[PDB]
Amino acid sequence: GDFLGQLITVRGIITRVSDVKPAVEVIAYTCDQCGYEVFQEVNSRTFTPLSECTSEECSQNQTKGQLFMSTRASKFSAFQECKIQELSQQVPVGHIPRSLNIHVNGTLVRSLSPGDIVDVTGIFLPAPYTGFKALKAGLLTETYLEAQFVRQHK
């Protein structure tokens, strides 16, 4: 846990590949009174819709608008993830292999069949998450890896 933020190279076995579904990144919002477009960037797991308007022209006025989002103007992203099991050759003599979560985004999706041997390189970032509520020691960081390049053996 000292290699956080570095650029690394791992290998293993693709195991329990998920499905590809779009990840919403930014959401457009039509004013319908002031005629602007409001934009909200979300980097969290969940989020909320926002208030009736946040224009500069609907502001400083008595009657603010009431908005709603739109689909075709938003930006999405290809999203799918999987888990990598240990290579089962460098494992110590009495151990059980672990796993690791890797998020995949964008172009490189639909390129990893399950049950293979692959070199995955990427950069090592945490995710804000802790386990059970009572077991929290106060700053518990759950990690992952973001995929950058695929080089497959075989």
Partner 1 sequence: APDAVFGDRVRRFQEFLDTFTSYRDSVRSIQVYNSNNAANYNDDQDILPHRIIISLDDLREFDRSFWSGILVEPAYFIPPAEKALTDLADSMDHPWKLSFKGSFGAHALSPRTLTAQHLNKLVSVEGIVTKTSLVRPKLIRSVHYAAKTGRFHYRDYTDATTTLTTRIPTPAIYPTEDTEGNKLTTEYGYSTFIDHQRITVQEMPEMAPAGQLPRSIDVILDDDLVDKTKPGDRVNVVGVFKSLGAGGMNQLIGFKTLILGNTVYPLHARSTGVAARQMLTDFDIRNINKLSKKKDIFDILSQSLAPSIYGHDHIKKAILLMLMGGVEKNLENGSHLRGDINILMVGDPSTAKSQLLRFVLNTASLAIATTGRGSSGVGLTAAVTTDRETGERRLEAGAMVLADRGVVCIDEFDKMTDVDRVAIHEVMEQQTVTIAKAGIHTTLNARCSVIAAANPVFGQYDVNRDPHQNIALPDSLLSRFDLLFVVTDDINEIRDRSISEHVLRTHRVTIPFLRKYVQYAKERVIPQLTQEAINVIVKNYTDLRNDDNTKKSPITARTLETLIRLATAHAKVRLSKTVNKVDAKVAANLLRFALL
Partner 2 sequence: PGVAKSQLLKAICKISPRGVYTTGKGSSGVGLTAAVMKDPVTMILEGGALVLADNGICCIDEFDKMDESDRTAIHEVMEQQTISISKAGINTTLNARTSILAAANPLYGRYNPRLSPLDNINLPAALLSRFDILFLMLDIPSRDDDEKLAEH
Contacts with partner 2, residue ranges (CB under 8 A): 18-19, 21, 80-81, 114-115, 154
Rounded Cα distance between 143 and 102, Å, is 9
Rounded Cα distance between 125 and 105, Å, is 14
Tokens of 132: 């059970």
Q: How far is the CB of 65 from partner 1 (least distance, A)?
A: 27
CB nearer to partner 2: give 101 or 141.
101
Any contact of residue 2 with partner 1 (CB under 8 A)?
Answer: yes
Any contact of residue 91 with partner 1 (CB under 8 A)?
Answer: yes
- Looking at 66, 97, 113, 150, which residue binds partner 1 (CB under 8 A)? 97
CA distances from 64 to 4, 38, 61, 101, 102 (A): 46, 14, 7, 45, 44
Q: Judged by CB under 8 A, which stretch of 57-65, 70-78, 94-102, 145-153 contacts partner 1? A: 94-102
